[PDB]
Design a protein around this ligand. Structure first.
Ligand SMILES: *Cc1c(COP(=O)(O)O)cnc(C)c1O
Ligand SMILES: *Cc1c(COP(=O)(O)O)cnc(C)c1O
Lengths: 454, 454
C-alpha cells in the first residue's frame, strides 16, 4: 500500500463516520489500518496496536478467521444474493434465524433482518407502532428512552438515543420520543445509597409514563449496559424494576443488545444477565464479529401472532434484509463462539480476570472508579481522589489526553467524556489483559503531569 | 437442502421483508431460492426462473461471479473489518471512494458510506440539515419529495418516500417533509400535451416551495426514474426544469440513484442521462451488484468545504460505514462493469433492444403502454385499448394476476399497481430479452380470459 497516496485519496474523496473533517484534514488524512490478526491491528507505518475496542465493540471472535472468509466465499459462489420481498427466502437467513432464536430464548422466537444496528431500531420503531395498531390500541405511540442512551445513527436511532449534541444535527428527536435520567451512579448518584439511586432512576421512567399518559406509551427502550454513553453499568435491581414497571402499564420492553449481545457481558445477550424478558431486541456488531454487515430484531411470539393472524403487509424491510452471504458468515461466527465456549469463557474467566486486573488501577492518583462486566469496562479519571470531580470542572478534557497516550503506547481504547473504556475481543488472553491494563497505567502516569498543569 | 425443513424453520423463526406474514404462513413458508447463475435463479423444487428483476433491482453484473467471491475472501483474510470512527480508515473504502468519484463526475468529489439505500437517505437527511446550519441558514430544514416516490424503509426513508400506505405504519412522515405530484403521464396526464403536463408537475414543486417559504426549504429529492413507484419515466425536459427550479431558490438538489445508478439507465448514474448536477446522490444495490451490503452518499465539493472549513464533529455514521470487505467487492464489481463495458452496452445495445422487444407487445389487447430506458421498463395493463382505464376501475387487480402467470411461466417480474415492470441484469443477452418479452406475452394471453371475467 502507498500509505501517503491512500491518505491523499482519503482527504480528496472519503468522509469518515462521526468525525471532525477539519481535524482529519489537519492530520493529513485518516490513519490507515492495513492488516490485523488476533487482537492486534497494524497501521500504514507499521505500528502494532492492541485493539482494546475489538474494532468497534464488535470483533468478538478476533481477527484472522480464515473460517469466516471461507464461509463467505462458499455462499457467494452458490447464491450471493436474493431478496426476501417476493414471498422468497434463502437457506442461510432461515438457518441463522433458528440459531439466533435458540440463543435468544424466552418468547423471542422470530428475527427480522437488517444490515446495521441503527436500522434494527428503525425496525423496532415501526414494528412496535404497527403492533399496537394491530392490537387495536392506536394511541400507544410514544417511546421512552434515557439521556446518554445510544441507539444508532439513523434519524430514528438518533431520536431514540439521548445524545443531545447528536440530536441537534438533523433537528432531532422526531415526535413521540421522551428521555429520562440514566442510571449513572458515579456521575449522577455519587454518595447516594445504590438502592435509593436505582429507585430514583426507575421512578423517573414511571413519572414520564404518567406525564405522557400510560395509554399513550408504546414501549421503553434501553441498553442493558450503556455502551457509547461510557460503559454505564446500572445498579443492582434496576432492570428487574424496569421490567416490573413495563408490565405494570402494559408497555413493551425493548433491549438494545447491539454491544451487549453475543458474549460481551458473559451471556448470549445482555438482558439474560439481568433475568428480564424483553419483547424485542436489537442486535448487530458481534452478530458477525463485524466480518460482514448484518443486523436483526428479535421479536416476541405474541407480536408475530398479531402479524400472522390479522395479516396485512408489514411494509418494512431492506434490500439486504436476510443477505445470504452475510447470514452465512453470521451463522459460522456463532458456531465458532459455541465451539470455543467464548460466552462462558467471558462469564467465568476473562471477565473476572479483567475485573481484578482493572482493580489494580484503583490506587492510581488519577482513578476515581473502575467498573466492568464481562469484557466491557471503564476507568474514571478524576482530579480529586474520593470524589467524581473532573479536571477543569469540564468533563471531556482529561479523557482524550489519556486516550492519546494509550494509543501512542500501543493500545486502542476510547475516551467517553473523562472515562477510559475497553471492549476487547472475546479471545483476549489473560496476559493480553495484563498488557492492556499495564499500558493504561503507563499512560495515566504520563498523563498525570499534563493534567495537573491544566 | 432439506426444503421442507427450511420452510418449517422459516415460519417458526423468520419474518421476511415487506411481506404479509399471514400470506406466507398460508403458503407453508417462503419459497426457497437455493442457487443462481447468469440471469437465472433456482428454487427448492427445481424450477429455473429467468430473473427479470436482477435480485432486487440490483444484481447488475449477474450471478455466478467467482471473481467477486474471491475479492471478499482475500480482503477478509487480510483485514475483515475496521472502523472509520477513530480518525482511522482502511485501503478498500478509500480506493472505492476515488473510483465512485470518478464515475460521479461534476462536483461530486466525496462519498459517505453506509450499508443500505435507506441509510444513505438518512445520511442525506442529516447532512443536508447540518450543512445549512454550518452555512448560517438554519431555517432551511424542509425536504420536498413526491407522492409515489420511494426512498427506503427507515423512518426517514419512509418519510422521504411518498407511499401513503407505508407512511401509515410508524405514523409517518416525520416533520419537515412535503410531497407533490409525481410526473406520471400515463396515469395522471393521459391525453395531455407532454410539455404542459411536465410544466404542471414542475409547478407543483414551486407552489410547495412558495407555500413552505423558500427560506425554509433545504432540498428537493427525487429518483431520476421512480423504481418501486412503477418505473415512472418523467416527460422530456422535466429534470432540467427541476434543476433550474432548485437553482432559482438556492435549494439543494438530491437525486436518489439507488436503482438508477451503475448502468441501469445507460449511464453510471441516472442524473447523468438528464444532464443535471445534483448536490447529493444516494447509491446502493448495483453499487456491489448486491454481492455484499454497502451504500454511499455522493457529496458535492461545496458541502465538504463547509465540513472542512467550519470543522466540528459531523455526529453521523455507522459501525459498517466503509466496511473493508464490502468496499473491496464493490470496487471489483465496478471493475467488472468497466472491463465488460456494461454501461455503454446498456446505452447502445441492450437498452434499445429492450425497447424494440417491448414495443412488440403494443398490439396486445391488454397493453395500454410500454416504456423503457436502458434496462428498466414497464408494461401497462388496461381494460380498454387506447385509454388508461383499469380493470374493475380499481388499480391493482389485474397486475398480480399477470405477474403470477409470468412467474409460473418462468419469469420473475413484479406488478406495481397494474404495471408489469422489469429490471434484468445488465449481462442479459438479446435472446434472453426475447425470452423475457415472450413470457410476458404468453402470460398476458393466459390472463386475458380471467381478467375479462372479473
Ligand atoms: C453500535 C450501536 C448502534 C448502532 O449500530 P450500527 O450498526 O452502527 O448502525 C445501536 N445501538 C447500540 C447499543 C450501539 O452500540
Ligand atoms: C431500494 C431503494 C431504496 C432503499 O434501499 P435499501 O437498501 O433497500 O434500504 C432507496 N431508494 C430507492 C430509489 C430504492 O429503490
Amino acid at each position: 500500500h502507498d500509505i501517503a497516496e491512500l491518505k491523499r485519496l482519503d482527504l480528496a474523496h472519503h468522509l469518515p463516520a462521526q468525525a471532525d473533517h477539519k481535524v482529519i484534514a489537519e492530520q493529513g488524512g485518516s490513519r490507515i489500518i492495513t492488516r490485523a490478526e488476533g487482537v492486534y491491528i497494524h497501521d500504514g507505518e507499521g505500528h502494532q496496536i492492541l485493539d482494546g475496542m475489538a474494532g468497534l465493540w464488535c470483533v468478538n471472535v478476533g481477527y484472522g478467521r480464515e473460517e469466516l472468509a471461507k464461509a463467505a466465499y462458499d455462499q457467494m459462489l452458490e447464491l450471493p444474493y436474493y431478496n426476501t420481498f417476493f414471498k422468497t427466502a434463502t437457506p442461510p437467513p432461515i438457518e441463522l434465524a433458528a440459531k439466533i432464536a435458540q440463543k435468544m430464548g424466552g418468547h423471542l422466537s422470530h428475527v427480522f433482518y437488517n444490515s446495521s444496528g441503527s436500522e434494527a431500531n428503525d425496525t423496532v420503531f415501526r414494528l412496535v407502532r404497527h403492533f399496537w395498531k394491530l392490537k387495536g390500541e392506536p394511541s400507544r405511540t410514544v417511546f421512552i428512552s434515557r439521556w446518554n442512551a445510544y441507539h444508532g445513527s439513523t434519524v430514528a436511532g438518533v431520536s431514540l438515543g439521548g445524545m443531545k449534541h447528536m440530536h441537534k444535527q438533523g433537528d432531532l428527536p422526531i415526535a413521540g420520543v421522551e428521555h429520562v435520567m440514566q442510571p449513572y451512579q458515579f456521575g449522577d448518584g455519587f454518595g447516594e445509597d445504590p438502592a435509593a439511586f436505582r429507585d430514583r432512576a426507575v421512578q423517573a421512567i414511571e413519572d414520564k409514563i404518567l406525564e405522557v399518559g400510560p395509554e399513550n406509551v408504546a414501549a421503553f427502550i434501553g441498553e442493558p449496559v450503556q455502551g457509547a454513553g461510557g460503559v454505564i453499568i446500572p445498579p443492582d435491581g434496576y432492570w428487574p424494576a424496569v421490567e416490573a414497571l413495563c408490565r405494570k402499564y402494559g408497555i413493551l420492553l425493548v433491549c438494545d443488545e447491539v454491544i451487549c449481545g453475543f458474549g460481551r457481558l458473559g451471556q448470549w445477550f445482555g438482558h439474560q444477565h439481568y433475568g428480564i424478558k424483553p419483547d424485542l431486541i436489537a442486535m448487530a456488531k458481534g452478530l458477525s464479529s463485524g466480518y460482514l454487515p448484518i443486523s436483526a430484531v428479535g421479536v416476541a411470539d405474541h407480536i408475530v401472532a398479531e402479524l400472522r393472524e390479522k395479516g396485512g403487509d408489514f411494509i418494512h424491510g431492506f434490500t439486504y434484509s436476510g443477505h445470504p452471504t452475510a447470514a452465512a458468515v453470521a451463522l459460522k461466527n456463532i458456531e465458532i463462539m459455541e465451539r470455543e465456549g467464548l460466552v462462558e469463557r467471558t462469564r467465568d474467566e476473562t471477565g473476572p480476570y479483567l475485573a481484578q486486573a482493572l482493580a489494580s488501577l484503583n490506587d492510581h492518583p488519577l482513578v476515581g472508579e473502575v467498573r466492568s462486566l464481562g469484557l466491557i469496562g471503564a476507568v474514571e479519571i478524576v482530579r480529586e481522589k474520593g470524589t467524581n470531580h473532573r479536571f477543569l470542572d469540564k468533563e471531556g478534557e482529561a479523557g482524550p489526553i489519556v486516550r492519546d497516550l494509550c494509543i501512542k503506547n500501543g493500545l486502542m481504547v476510547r475516551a467517553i467524556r473523562d472515562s477510559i473504556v475497553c471492549c476487547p475481543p472475546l479471545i483476549i488472553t489473560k496476559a493480553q489483559i495484563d498488557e492492556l491494563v499495564g499500558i493504561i497505567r503507563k499512560s495515566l502516569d504520563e498523563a498525570e503531569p499534563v493534567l495537573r498543569a491544566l
